[PDB]
Each structure stands twice: as C-alpha cells, then as structure tokens.
C-alpha cells in the first residue's frame, strides 16, 4: 500500500491482526486498521468466564481510615482492661458509641 | 513486552501462582508468543500479528 516515512523514518498505516489462544491453537479474532480496530465474527474466548469484557478493576469493602487527635471531635482514651471501652451513657440516655483505635502513645 | 525466556519464566511463575482466573486482562506483543514461550502460554490470551512481515 502507501509507503510513507514519518519524522522517525518509519512506515505508517501498518495492518495488524488479532489472534486468540483457543485451546492452544491460534485463531484470528480481529484486525487493526491504520487507526481503527475491526473485530471479526470469531468469538472472544477468555481464560475465565464470559466472552464479554471482564471488568478487571477490583474493588474493596474494607477501608483503612486515618484521623487525627481533634479535641472536640476525636477523643482519646486508653482501654479499661484489654481492648475494651467503658460503656458510658450520655445525660440523654444514649450510650456513647466508641471505636477501637490504634495509635502511638506520644511523639 | 520482553524476551521469550522472560515470557516463559513469567508464564510459569504465574501458572504456579494461579493468576489465570476470571477477570484477568491479558495482552502481549508478537515477540512474546513464539518459541518455547508459546509452550507455556495460558489459554485465552490475545496476540497480535505483523501482516506480510516475513515474505
């Protein structure tokens, strides 16, 4: 086709093919145009489950929160006996919901 | 993007570590699926081809 050297002196608009490992026999599954990708009718079989694209971006349900010693918002108290917080009740009859926090003693 | 020795090595290590399950995205170049590297290639991988790069 057209031969054209870029500022790097290299050929552009090269045609690339896409192959897939289907039981260890290569199968043509797509092509790459000069600037476009044209998949064929062959199925996209993946190592895992569906032929659809697996969203390989994991998530988490355990957040590691950091906070600082703020006098009216974040109070610090040593545990009573072992990792336990004294269940003090407010003047309104509402128990104080505490949380087990791990931090250094001093600077 | 590496040599075929490195490709076979990492395929063997990943097969030992079982990282070829569902959700894994695999994408390799042309140099990575030739020689003995093709031998250790986990199934379901995607490869590219240089058209008429050898004729």
């Amino acid at each position: 086709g057209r031969v054209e050297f870029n500022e790097d002196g290299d050929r552009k608009f090269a045609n690339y093919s896409i192959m897939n490992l289907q039981n260890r026999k290569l199968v043509q599954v797509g092509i790459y145009n000069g600037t476009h990708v044209i998949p064929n009718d062959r199925k996209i079989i993946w190592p895992g489950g569906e032929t659809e694209k697996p969203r390989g971006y994991q998530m988490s349900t355990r957040l590691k929160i950091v906070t600082i010693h703020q006098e009216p918002f974040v109070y610090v108290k040593p545990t009573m006996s072992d990792g336990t917080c004294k269940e003090e009740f407010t003047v309104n009859g509402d128990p104080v919901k505490k949380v087990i926090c791990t931090g250094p003693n001093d600077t | 993007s590496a040599s075929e020795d490195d490709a076979a090595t990492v395929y063997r290590a990943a097969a030992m570590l079982n990282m070829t399950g569902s959700g894994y995205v695999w994408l390799v170049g042309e140099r990575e699926i030739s020689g003995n590297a093709l031998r250790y290639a986990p199934d379901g991988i995607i490869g590219l081809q240089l058209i008429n790069g050898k004729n």
Partner: antibody
C-alpha cells in the same frame, strides 16, 4: 488447491543424518501449521512434531525430541525435517501434512504430501 | 496417549447392505465447556493420502455422501454406512483432535471388504 511436495527416497547409512524437504503451495504458508508423521509400512502413522511458520514455534514428540529438528524457509514456503542418528528403526515412510482449521477450530489434516521412504 | 479402540477390526459385506464400525477412546473426548467431541473419522484407500470423512463424531464433510453416518459421544463412537458401495472399500481410522490431550493417536483401524 494447496499442494505439498516431499523429497525423494533416501538411502542413509545407520547413524548418519537425513534432512527431508516438503515444499508447500496453494495456501497461506505463514498462517498454517505443518506436521511431520512417521509411518512404517503396514503400520499407522506416528506423529513426530508440529511447527508454526508465523512464529517458529516448535513442538516435538518426546520419542523424537532429541532425534528430529524442524526448519522452514518463508521465501520458498518449504518445510524441513532433519532426522539425525538414523537407525534401522527409521526405515519408514515420512509424510508432511497441512492442518485444516475451520472457524478458527482445527478439524483435522486436510492436505497431504506424496510420502517419502527413508532406507 | 488416549487409547483409541476400533471395532470391528475388519468386515466383508455385500453391496447395498448396512454396516457399523465403532470407535472407543480410553478417555472422554468431550470438553464440557463447549460440549464438543474431539473425534474425527477418516477414509484411507490404498496408495492415497487419507481423506477426512467425519469430524466431531457426527459431522460429515462436504464431499461425504449422506449414506455415511457417524454417531457416539464421550468415549464411545460409531461410524455407520446405511448403503454400502464398492467405492467405500477402504481402511477407516478414528483419531482424536483434543489439543489438551496431546499427542494425537489413532485407533487400530477397520478394513472394509466387499
């Protein structure tokens, strides 16, 4: 239609080496798979090795991994099998065949050479 | 190597009759994910390269007449000819095509006589 032509008959001394040729034509030489099979007379064919021309990927039978070597020439689209340390057990007919693949799924050997007898 | 068992070893019949040839693999050639049998039936005549007859243990080739019928699944397979002709006289081999079950092996073979 694709054609695969093999080399002629060979008389080789025991312990010596032979290198057989298999010219291929009529199809995409680079994007197909070629297999060498050993068939003794009156016996079924024994798979020796397969090679992919597009990537030079080679895989041999364990019985012939240390005995046979495969090479290809893209300019001539000809397959090569070099059999070394030949013994009287190697007195047999060797064939080269092209794999038939449909919809990306291999369906068997669809093309064959004429066969070569090594004595 | 998966052991391919072919039965009968040979048979002789008159033209127009119906024959049956069985193929048994030592292992299941069916892959569960796609439910396809990696079995191929072939027709091999004297002095000629073998001609691919039936693949997948059930699908005839385009050149294969409807008289040929391949059946069986899993480990056991069967090749059946409803109307036997003289031209069909050949040695038929069943061979596995399962890539995960390398190397490719062949059965004992069945010789057809008329």
């Amino acid at each position: 239609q694709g054609q695969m032509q093999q080399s002629g008959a060979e008389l080789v001394k025991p312990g010596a080496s032979v290198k057989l040729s298999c010219k291929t034509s009529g199809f995409s030489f680079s994007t197909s798979y070629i297999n060498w099979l050993k068939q003794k007379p009156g016996q079924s064919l024994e798979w020796i090795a397969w090679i992919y021309a597009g990537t030079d990927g080679t895989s041999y039978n364990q019985k012939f991994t240390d005995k046979a070597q495969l090479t290809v020439d893209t300019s001539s689209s000809t397959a090569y099998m070099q059999f070394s340390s030949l013994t009287t057990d190697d007195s047999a007919i060797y064939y080269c065949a092209r794999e038939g693949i449909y919809y990306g799924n291999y369906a068997g050997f669809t093309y064959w050479g004429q066969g070569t007898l090594v004595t | 190597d998966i052991v391919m068992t072919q039965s009968p070893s040979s048979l002789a019949v008159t033209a127009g009759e119906k024959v049956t040839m069985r193929c048994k693999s030592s292992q299941s050639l069916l892959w569960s994910v796609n439910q396809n049998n990696y079995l191929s039936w072939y027709q091999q005549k004297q002095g000629q390269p073998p001609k691919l007859l039936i693949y997948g243990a059930s699908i005839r080739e385009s050149w294969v007449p409807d008289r040929f019928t391949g059946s069986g699944s899993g480990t056991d397979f069967t090749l059946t000819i409803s109307n036997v002709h003289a031209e069909d006289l050949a040695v038929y081999y069943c061979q596995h095509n399962h890539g995960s079950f390398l190397p490719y092996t062949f059965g004992g073979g069945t010789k057809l006589e008329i």
